[PDB]
């Protein structure tokens, strides 16, 4: 082959993934989250790695090491800010990505979708650790609960814990190993992200009409390379406006107080991108039940594909399920609000209500409204 | 048939007002390309700017550490250092030498064939009081601490790659490139000495 | 040699107080060819007038008033002469090849046609259904439909995007009148050319023309020839897909300068460089023409050809290839690459060959009476006078590599091309891709 | 899945124009902004509802909480 | 005719094009920087140390 | 000064006729005419002719496949081979001095072929296509078969290598074929735009073979063959012949004249959407005469019958001495005209210089066509109606008659 | 009381896939059965459905739609694939049944 | 020397809202310290006052500070 | 009762996304911190080094560091010993360890005002309201011994007595040292203390906006430009007869 863009075992990979890769002509913004996601993984790894050059995994030094990194290392403050907020633009993007997928039956591509669920999970895990790193009040008490969270597993539980973190209570040992996981996981993400795209590329990308797009399909490059570099800059301005104008906008101030193993502050609020789950956990008054509920809240994603009853893929022509959809998105949005609230009557109930509308809108409403719309078509 | 197919009207519908028949497309657009590439040129331009700085920042994000000290002054009792021996002090992040030289040493150090030195300097222009020699205990080759009272020149020796130094701190034999660093210093009295 | 060129007889021309220019080249040859080459075409047709020139072509022979069908053919058949002809977009021609012992008889016959066609309203209605059929044949000549479309979009919106044959609606409805309208409007002396080649003596030809072409101009208009509307080129594409066809055709081009422009020589030498290929040749070791070579090594096409089809004030410089559903891309890629190489890094070694190859066609272009006649006709009609192979010789014998680059880059580099492609063309990449293919990542 | 092996397509003609020959700008106002609206108005009634709704539950809920915070004038009229 | 002269010289040849990006970036920088700073410093008169630097260095 | 410079001919001691003719044209074209062909093939070696026809560009002992193609092209040359069942003409064309250069290659191509076992085993698949394109014209298919039914032996062999033998032609069979035919006594170094002394001073190198006639094809036995190819093409192709007329063979000019006498007749004797003509091939020791008719399917039987009746009653005295007068004139044209293009003209001076060794001037060649008339024709037609007929057909044929039905 | 008939025309215009100019069957997700059905589809209907879909893709990719006039009407929508599809399904269910 | 704070707080303690609250407060105060056994506190009332007060203290105080 | 009073919002000279910090006002803040807070409040992450070039002069800050004797490294006999504070030392801890401080403050632990402004919701607005905001507890409410009422603080009873009143010090720049005034200057200090970047960081945000502003549009034209080929495009179904 003369090409060279097709005859090079390595170079072909690029010219087989970002140029020449056939993509449906009709692709909305809702397909941009992904390339952004990949970019977040980059941004993160880069900044984070840069930031790890000055961190010092150790109780007596962690907290201060971070401070020194901001106050002393040139731009270290910028770096941290970008790292800190990237976590967010990362979840924002991932959240939107999952959404899109849910509302176009992108989930029918199972493997691509299942690996996806693994990414969410890992991203979540990698983001928990690390936040534990600067070792401020939040860092610590987060570490104590999320880990203790495994206590619920009978037998193998309390054990798994006093092993999970250092020895018998969040302490130095449990910090140094967290720095490690956190340094190690982002790569595992990138890793799985490769596998992910792989199963994707097997079957073309999806497309909003939910109907074959072989009739069209443009060369990724000329087009989407551009569309993406654009989506890049748009969802780049907000995030840079935070890191530059209101850095701690999305970050609890409570975590500016070094950790005190003897006082969990009143008003402990998990970092926003974890609230919904959180909300669900507390509102099912049982160590275990609560945990299971938590489990399910995220782990449910695996069942989405088996809850597809529509004879149509996307749900652009399903006005019914279509609103059912937004009911959910908002249902979620509420759980978030509820999650940022102390446990009082005005709330709580609202909590367990939403925290239920969630599960049904998913395990029951959807499939039902599903086959229903079908019959409204003679199918 | 096929003689029946016609290309539709893209008239005002799209076409830039320099493209509506009876007149060359050429000569017109080959000015239009200019604009459309100007946006582009400029974008690469702006991006360039952006890039140049993100790198600059993320580059000094290590280079040095905005945690730099200063300690330029140290007091030393010249009597701590009897004749014939060299004492090593803790100073400014790297060792510091202060040596009491014998009649013999100072003599040999002046007797040095200066036009033949790797780094040409006469012992007397490197020190103030000939019985007192002060040096930065860091080899110029690759940074190891030269060993005093060792080597083939009665000065120093670097065990990393074998550089031989004289009582003047000058590099004589071995790979080191220039002579040992001479700090800024002065004697405030008979037994007093201050470096920096 | 150069002598062989100089020793070649000059081409005689002489205009009538009519408008008809009479030119001719003499030789020993008993036989010969003579004809009238009109400055008519589909480019001169309207939206409702499109087709005339052709529908007309098909009756120009079926007899005149002076001598009905049976008679014309009979009188022609009987004298062993061949009367054939054609109608392009800007050039129409009618010609006979007789034994020169008939310069006069032929001339008269010619005249009787450009002037008195029966146009029997009955013979028409019959040719109507014929063309309409003949047109249905023309359709499955993918090799052709591919070019019409090219024009169809390259000159979208102007007279040049109209095909010569015309829509099947016009052919079904042209009126006995319309054909006459066309005839009386465009077949006028100041535009027609009486040319001939063989053992004919110019004078006898003059006097013969001068005698049967008794045209007479009164007004100033009569004496003048109308300049056409300019045709707007438009870098665009037209894709008529059908994965049902055996394979696909692809043609892409840039606006060309036009007959008058002297570069068409340099430009001609360029196309001489990459040349054309066909799976019957005999040279996976072909001359430079890498396209060919690469075509051969990588089995890129069934065939591909280069071309500088030109007109009065515009033209199409491009190339065309036929290929399996599967190698469309590599072919475009490999070929479009050659366009760059051509105006980015062409060597003397190449032009050297390029030129000679041209001079070889330059020559065999005039291989016989008919062909020679074909040039005199065209020459005058488009260039003004005749262009002697001794001139062409000079013109193109002075082209250097540097000059080719100069020009090709001038007409090719970073221009928005016109693409056409019928067939199983799914593998041909979008316009942008083949567009950025116009500038080399120098 | 590469190009040249996607589907059996027949009889589709398309016509497109060099990006330099048309105007990317395009026709805002003529067809531009009109469609934009053609869409806000097309889903504003399918999307907003659930969001609007939450809004209320939000307001209601907070207010209620904030109200439940103050003293009952009569919790001790004595 | 700017655009046409800009294309014909700068934008046409892929070579030239880049080269001007570089030379263009340079100018854009010096220019953009001075300005932003100006705008900025202006919007903050007498609050910057540059502005107070003088009560131990006059103004 | 006038360009008249009689075409000289000088038969070398070998038998290598050499005919030139400076016509001062800028571009000259030389050519090696040979009495080779598919007529000299056996049950085996079949198609070797064809494969030999394509090995034109394979390496020689003086120049490689490479040099040969790029050498001819470096000058803007042309090297090509035209071949019939009983003759192969290797022409080459260029100009000025380049003729001298263009020769080396021609020379080697016809005398120093070293048909390399790979180059050939590596070329044979080409037959497949060369043939595939040829057969795109139904005319060729019919005619290929016509000869198969008209004859039973040499000359009845295919001009395009049979399929079953596409990959079996040996490197050997080629040399053996060349050696036995590409010999001085059955060759001719014809050419244009050249001085004769120059063109002769080359046949000196060309001297590298002698064996008069190396294999001399077996006489052509005639037969009233009849082969039908059912294939459904919406339109039938048919050809009807009766052995007759040998080249040089006196009785020939009659049919050429009957050939034109016929036509306005068969065509104008069949009404509806079709095509019909008077076929005429004149070979070395035999020939064919009749008519092919491309006709719509169902109107197949009608057209061939009608066109046949015409050849019939044209024999039973349906020829005005006027008809003959016109036809005698058309031949005068088609001969003369088809001599304008330097390639079709180099064909005359060559074809003859090989078959005879002479050159009948356009004067007597006419005096010979003029020579006969009313006299024959009417009779020539008779010979058609009485002799045995061999027909060939391609198409639906469901409506096409057989010879046994006339 | 309330016609499913009345309902179906509701949903049909509610769904809105007719605004892109495609029939109901043009939208059925292509799972195994659909693929095998569409595969049996006579060449007429196939090529039509193709164009229909491509047009839609092109519309969707432009954000615009079909002019009110061109939207297909509920009663005029043609279930060109439904029949083939059913046979396909019962053909299959039969096999499945047998392989027990 | 007088703290522009106390000055501005004076002015502000008379804006409609404050007085409304101050009163609402004065009553609570003399309502609790009036009884010997009651759980009521006047923090609420006090806050509403303060809140309203300082709110404007803030919308003006910084003008008079350097 | 989880009943609390949230601090109002002051129009800080540095509030705005593009507005820097009143460096002069911070100079004062330093002073109010150095002369009054720095005796109960440590500020571990800052050092004289920073003051240089932001609100102080090198020689000025050097000298300002001299005023503190610090315990430094082992002798040649190895024994902590005092010496003049270098420019590099950080601000001096008032206590050896927390329990030491808690002892010296009726049991309470005065926090480190390094990241105070962003360790509390409301930042300066809060810290300001807190300092300039003590008073008598309303009725029914009784603050215990050692404490002092302050409605702004969660629980109303802080361990810190009003630390700032008129004239507690004398701004050497000739500024009316009213409690309010001096309380402002502290906070504005405390902010820069929590984030020296502040100014740099905003000037940066500025330039950022301009680029997004210039670049997203430019890449927007480009995206459009390329895509036109498709937006503009026109299909057409022309089957045979
Ligand atoms: C960890 C980071 C992840 C990255 C970098 C990422 C990126 C991508 C990419 C590059 C695409 C391309 C098309 C598009 O953007 O829509 C893709 C598609 C998709 N991803 Fe992910 N993904 C991640 C996580 C996930 C998650 C959590 C889900 C699970 C809900 C998911 C589900 C999918 C699906 C369904 C598709 C294919 C359907 C379609 O393209 O229409 N991805 N992913
Ligand atoms: C994607 C858009 C990126 C915008 C470019 C970031 C500009 C950062 O520019 C910064 O500005 C500071 C204030 O003058 C300087 O002190 C820094 O040295 C400089 O790198
Ligand atoms: S380290 Fe000193 S000799 Fe190399």
- Classify the beta-strand content of chain G into a percent band: under 5%
Give the oligomer, counting copies of the same chain as homo and different chains as hetero: 9 chains of a larger assembly
- Strand element count of chain B: 10
H/E element order of chain B: HEEEHEEEEEEE
CATH architecture of the largest domain in chain B: 3-layer Sandwich
CATH C-level class of the largest domain in chain B is Mainly Beta
Rg of chain G is: 16 Å
What is the number of independent domains of chain B? 2
Number of domains of chain G: 1
Rg of chain B over CA atoms, rounded to whole Å, is 36 Å
- CATH homolog superfamily of chain G: Cytochrome b-c1 complex subunit 7
Summing up helix and strand content along with how strands pair, one would put the structural category of chain B as alpha+beta
Describe the 3D structure.
- The structure holds 9 chains of a larger assembly.
- Chain A is 59% helix and 1% strand.
- With 379 residues, chain A is mainly α.
- Chain A has one domain (1-379): Up-down Bundle (Cytochrome Bc1 Complex, Chain C).
- A two-stranded antiparallel sheet of chain A has the order 1-2.
- In chain A, helix 5 (110-131) packs antiparallel against helix 8.
- Chain A is globular.
- Chain C is an alpha+beta fold and 442 residues long.
- Chain C has helices spanning 2-6, 52-57, 69-77, 103-115, 121-139, 142-154, 168-173, 176-186, 202-212, 220-223, 263-274, 290-297, 328-344, 348-364, 369-383, 389-397, 401-411, 431-435; strands at residues 12-15, 21-26, 32-38, 82-87, 92-97, 193-198, 236-242, 248-255, 277-278, 303-307, 316-323, 418-423.
- Chain G has one domain (1-100): Cytochrome b-c1 complex subunit 7 (Cytochrome Bc1 Complex, Chain F, Orthogonal Bundle).
- The radius of gyration of chain G is 16 Å and the shape is globular.
- Chain G starts with a helix and ends with a helix.
- Chain I starts with 22 loop residues before the first helix and ends in a 9-residue tail after the last helix.
- Chain I is 39% helix and 5% strand.
- Chain I folds into two domains: 197-241, Up-down Bundle (Single alpha-helices involved in coiled-coils or other helix-helix interfaces), CATH 1.20.5; 1-196, Cytochrome Bc1 Complex, Chain D, domain 2.
- In chain I, helix 1 (23-37) packs across helix 6 and helix 5 packs antiparallel against helix 6.
- Chain I has a two-stranded antiparallel sheet. Chain I has a two-stranded antiparallel sheet with strand order 3-4.
What's the SSE blueprint?
The structure holds 9 chains of a larger assembly.
Chain C: H1 2-6, E1 12-15, E2 21-26, E3 32-38, H2 52-57, H3 69-77, E4 82-87, E5 92-97, H4 103-115, H5 121-139, H6 142-154, H7 168-173, H8 176-186, E6 193-198, H9 202-212, H10 220-223, E7 236-242, E8 248-255, H11 263-274, E9 277-278, H12 290-297, E10 303-307, E11 316-323, H13 328-344, H14 348-364, H15 369-383, H16 389-397, H17 401-411, E12 418-423, H18 431-435
Parallel strand pairs in C: 2-6, 7-12
Antiparallel strand pairs in C: 1-2, 3-5, 3-6, 4-5, 8-11, 8-12, 9-10, 10-11
Helix pairs in contact in C: 4-9, 11-14, 11-17, 12-13, 13-17, 14-16
Chain E: H1 2-11, H2 14-42, H3 49-52
Chain F: E1 29-34, H1 48-54, H2 65-74, E2 78-84, E3 87-93, H3 98-111, H4 117-121, H5 125-134, H6 138-150, H7 171-179, E4 187-191, H8 196-200, E5 226-230, E6 235-241, H9 252-261, H10 264-268, E7 274-276, E8 279-282, E9 287-296, H11 300-313, H12 321-337, H13 342-355, H14 364-371, H15 378-386, E10 390-395
Parallel strand pairs in F: 5-10
Antiparallel strand pairs in F: 1-3, 1-4, 2-3, 6-9, 6-10, 7-9, 8-9
The structure holds protoporphyrin IX containing FE, octyl beta-D-glucopyranoside and FE2/S2 (inorganic) cluster (FES).
PDB class: oxidoreductase
Keywords: ubiquinone, oxidoreductase, redox enzyme, membrane protein, respiratory chain, stigmatellin
Entry title: stigmatellin-bound cytochrome BC1 complex from chicken
